[PDB]
Design a protein around this ligand. Structure first.
Ligand SMILES: [K+]
Ligand SMILES: [K+]
Ligand SMILES: [K+]
Ligand SMILES: [K+]
Ligand SMILES: [K+]
Ligand SMILES: [K+]
Ligand SMILES: [K+]
Ligand SMILES: [K+]
Ligand SMILES: [K+]
Ligand SMILES: [K+]
Lengths: 292, 292, 292, 292
């Protein structure tokens, strides 16, 4: 059974001066993340600007990240879209470049039913030998993957985990309860890392871990240790930093924050825009205020 | 200035037994719609299963529809996606096969800002000489195109209309109020056709027109002639029929309904599924209620 | 059958400098409304600050308004609360003072079921021979009176109308459709007056009628005569003025706007507060922009 | 500083066969709760059917509960309504019969502003020497007490705690962080007890404690000890049991569940109704699944 650990990072996709994938910067980022508390990498997900990457770009990115990582942590590719046939095709291509797992989001835009999603996820999982992590995100796809649908899917051999960004730890609770011990529930919301783990989440699929991954591992350890005050103080930092990263559409703030701390990863592709000057000043003040 | 008329139909994409585009069934559907009150055709939009069509399929479909239509009504291509660069590419390709206008939806999944959407739509609109219709649909894209953003976009020469599927006639009111006379607001919700036209909407971008186009035409003629009683009775039918078409994910019910009235357009692509027998019989009862 | 006409006004309760009911100012307000397009008066409703009036003050207000109105327009008393027994008591008292009907709100705070609300409204309607208007207001009570529940209640002889502030003209449509001709549906949102009447609503229960009652009747007459450009212009005005009246908690804005047009009706009781200076400037600009 | 402990209970109000307060059943219930993990009693709150109790009933109920409790745990009276003047009156009356604190809910129905609520709570608190617990319940009152408003109120000497039923452990996090050590945040939802405590909440104001108080006590002891496996096991039970208690309008399910385990506390007052036989069977099957 594959182990993504406590912090899977939803990695940004660095771009060069012309807006193309910057593989040199990607190498720097991957090595930084692994040395700063990242236990698995999600490549080409939402935070990696999957919507504006071509299929060819996605596969080149998956391949480069796999190569650099060199089996140090699991690499999860965001191959799932709202098109089942296309999702199968991309999943096959990611498998061919040696990723360890795939992330499959609830189809966005077309608003599928519970059974539609079941057949969607079932069809993609059957097409690959790789482990599958589901991704519930009604904040982006509108639909929810119901507890019962998640449970049914968990009975499929290679569907091993879920990123639950539904913002609701009570639905998380029920998923945790009604699925087997070898099915893992991750938070998809940085701010909920602590309370999600309190109810049985294995960890977090993170955006904030780009800049405070060490602090996050420290919080998780402290909680697991029973050091509630220590964990709570770091939780307060995590909430504050997370919030500053979502005042403009992600991933634009986290890319700018990385640049502020000496890891330039370029800008973003339309329809996303760079930060305004006012937005930048606000973010920098937050970044400067992180205890060092 | 292009005139889309009172009923633009969000056309389904007919498929054969194996899910491929059925060009012969498409020919029959196009002729049927034009003979049943459709004044413009939207090709390859949400109702046309845009998420599961490839770019090459879309273009092949636009080309075919252009041929069959033979300039009888305007042909609007659903070229907008959540990727600006890709949207410019597909818009160019549609222009080259002789479509008359393009539909650009608010980017789904990546949750752009108002300014992001402004630059997105501006970039696409400047890439083509064709008229552009905006498409507001928060129920699928999460984001709303704000009234102010729409007003700004209306000042761009070839941005001439908006399909507002926000379900709110008061926001439509304000758009109608704050834009020039040569900028048209369409309802994107069949049920709201009558009340939207009461506050100044030009017409409807319709799904229900696949099965009650003539009744809708009659209702609009009644309202425009001040015959409010006559319109209200047809309005009650339209609301009833429309609701029955969205009890399962669209466009599956309207495709099933078309088969019931002798126009087979096949089924749907995953992640969408055929109606269950329970769903079919529920739909059939409402279809049967249409006065003949 | 009782006829509330096209504009029932949710009348504010004038208070003197000590926060007590001002009887002279109430008389002035009543005569003003009757001379400015009001066809029925709702006394002691939400807009009349029912929550902060004592039981004794409510009945005194009912008494005074009945005596001043002198059968010129119907007087509707807001006797319903979230307590059925109390609602019966207050309804009987209002009946004895000689009001013409009672308004019964969906119970707030305690979140009753559909069947609970059915029994609530049935028990109150039972206690009086007077006509009863239901008041659906999920924006204050959270719960909705379902279409099916309204239809059942409409079958009770003296339940003759509903004020629907659900903000949904399509649920209104269904109520209009499924109830008898002698059961009236009123909009409970000033902005929706035009679109609601377009789908068969009899009129509006209004707040904006305190300040633009003539313009509202002008709009309704223009619509009914098929003068759509005129109606749409007045509609745009109604929407804009209405919105300005709800930027701070009602009824505080409309009380201030009355004073701006020379009807001082005093201030409000806690937990409501006077408008801030910023708020007063904002409202004043909207009020002085009304074309008269 | 008053200490409400980890499990305050929102006590139901027992009624006799005529729907009047049953004082003997109240005595039985109070003693039961105290022997089953309850550390503070909230009297005459929402769960105690405050909307349908007269002021005279409330005061008699407070007085009796004060008598039976005999200083073993704090008695908190639900004196706050949506009328500030009335809330001061009832607060005085509760103070006079010897309660230990009062609970003040966000005004429902009239939708006050943040500053309105600030002045409301400030004025009531000023009127009594007793400690005050605020009650945030947007699910019943619509409005929220913002974090900022809660922080400002926490600076008032006798405002010492908040029951937060907003359902959001991240707003709780911020309140906890920004208020002094002597200001306590309680979850207002049973299911959130564990995740709320994980971020620094003192405890829960509970409904489920009527039936599984001992289980919740063991859950909290396990959690505070850092035995998360057992805490998570009991958390799962708490969530399950709690959900079943809100499938019909509370408090009707918890009263019925109490009757099912031999503590008959009677029925409910209109607009609330007894459970149907179907609702009763559904509740019974969940209650019967509680381990004994
Ligand atoms: K599995
Ligand atoms: K599990
Ligand atoms: K234009
Ligand atoms: K216009
Ligand atoms: K205009
Ligand atoms: K009736
Ligand atoms: K009717
Ligand atoms: K009817
Ligand atoms: K304090
Ligand atoms: K604190």
């Amino acid at each position: 059974m594959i182990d993504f650990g406590t912090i899977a990072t939803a990695m940004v996709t660095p771009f060069d001066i012309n807006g193309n994938i910057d593989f040199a910067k990607t190498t720097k980022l991957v090595n930084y993340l692994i040395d700063n508390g990242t236990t698995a990498i999600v490549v080409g997900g939402t935070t990696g600007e999957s919507p504006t990457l071509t299929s060819e770009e996605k596969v080149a990115l998956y391949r480069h990240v796999v190569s650099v990582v060199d089996k140090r942590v699991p690499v999860i590719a965001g191959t799932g879209s709202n098109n089942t046939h296309a999702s199968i095709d991309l999943t096959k291509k990611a498998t061919e470049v040696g990723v360890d797992a795939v992330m499959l989001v609830a189809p966005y835009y077309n608003k599928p039913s519970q059974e539609g999603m079941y057949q969607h996820f079932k069809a993609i999982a059957e097409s690959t030998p790789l482990p599958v992590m589901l991704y519930n995100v009604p904040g982006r796809s509108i639909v929810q993957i119901s507890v019962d649908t998640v449970v049914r899917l968990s009975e499929i051999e290679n569907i091993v985990a879920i990123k639950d960004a539904g913002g609701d730890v009570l639905t998380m609770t029920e998923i945790i309860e009604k699925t087997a011990d070898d099915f893992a529930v991750y938070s998809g919301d940085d701010g909920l890392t602590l309370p999600a783990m309190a109810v049985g989440a294995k960890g977090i699929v993170s955006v904030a871990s780009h800049v405070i991954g060490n602090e996050m591992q420290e919080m998780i350890a402290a909680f697991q240790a029973g050091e509630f005050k220590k964990a709570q103080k770091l939780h307060q930092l995590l909430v504050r930093v997370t919030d500053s990263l979502f005042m403009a559409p992600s991933p634009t703030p986290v890319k700018t924050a990385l640049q502020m701390v000496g890891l330039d990863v370029g800008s973003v592709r339309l329809p996303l825009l760079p930060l305004t000057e006012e937005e930048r000043v606000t973010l920098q003040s937050v970044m400067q205020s992180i205890p060092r």
